[PDB]
RNA sequence: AAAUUGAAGAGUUUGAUCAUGGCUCAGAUUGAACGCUGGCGGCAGGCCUAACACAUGCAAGUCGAACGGUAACAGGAAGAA
């Protein structure tokens, strides 16, 4: 019972001897809403087939996120090719302050309160890749506590 | 007790892509102006330009418990109706 969200549909084209060959690419994201989120990207000669391929690729290749009561553990920075992403944990009641692709990722991921901002290029594919890379690199107090070989009294 | 609890993007270069990069938009705000329209009230605001020139009226008077006074109006007055 995971939530699936179509982020962007784009029409690309390859040229051949006869003319242009138009195909469609769809970027989606799925997530169970409590710390697991994955994005899929499918190209197809039609829009529904592209969305189906994106959903199948997104249902696999899902990552785990260490949430903290529905928000981030700490401010994180995600970077892909052109997009640089900043996410920050907020208090209860603020919502998701983020761009379209960031909103989709953080909403299907299970994040409820976050202050986010996208720098550089706002390309949807690179934005969702940067968001996923920033969320999977976010660690919890138990992780750092066990990695430091000392109790979790820092929490 | 409270008195920083706060951060959104989109369109456009290409047959298509990523990046760079500028232009434009979505938000607030104003001593505002113009166009169409216009019922009431409360609170505020109202020459941003020519520190250009000014008709007219007012905007700095007051004290007789400082003084010599009596010109005006109100009285007291002696004497002539």
UniProtKB/Swiss-Prot annotation:
Keywords assigned: Acetylation, Antibiotic resistance, Ribonucleoprotein, Ribosomal protein, RNA-binding, rRNA-binding
Outcome recorded upon mutating residue 103 to S: In strain: NEA-319; neamycin resistant
UniProt entry tagged with the keyword rRNA-binding: yes
Family matches, as Pfam families: Ribosomal_S5, Ribosomal_S5_C
Record-annotated S5 DRBM domain positions: 2-65
GO cellular component: cytoplasm; cytosol; cytosolic small ribosomal subunit
Lineage top rank: taxon: Bacteria
Family matches, as InterPro entries: Ribosomal_Su5_D2-typ_SF, Ribosomal_uS5, Ribosomal_uS5_bac-type, Ribosomal_uS5_C, Ribosomal_uS5_N, Ribosomal_uS5_N_CS, Ribsml_uS5_D2-typ_fold_subgr
Effect of residue 11 to L: In strain: SPCR9; spectinomycin resistant. Not a ram mutation
Biological process (GO), any one: translation
GO molecular function: rRNA binding; structural constituent of ribosome
Signal peptide: none
Summary of the function given for this chain in its UniProt record: With uS4 and uS12 plays an important role in translational accuracy. Many suppressors of streptomycin-dependent mutants of protein uS12 are found in this protein, some but not all of which decrease translational accuracy (ram, ribosomal ambiguity mutations).
Record-stated family: Belongs to the universal ribosomal protein uS5 family.
Record's comment describing the protein's domains: The N-terminal domain interacts with the head of the 30S subunit; the C-terminal domain interacts with the body and contacts protein uS4. The interaction surface between uS4 and uS5 is involved in control of translational fidelity.
Note, other: Altered uS5 proteins have been identified in a number of mutants. Some mutations in uS5 have been shown to increase translational error frequencies. Some mutants in this protein can partially suppress an alanyl-tRNA synthetase mutant.
Subunit structure: Part of the 30S ribosomal subunit. Contacts proteins uS4 and uS8. With proteins uS4 and uS5 encircles the mRNA as it enters the ribosome, which may play a role in mRNA helicase processivity. Can be cross-linked to mRNA. In collided ribosomes contacts ribosome rescue factor SmrB.
Protein name: Small ribosomal subunit protein uS5
Gene from which the chain derives: rpsE
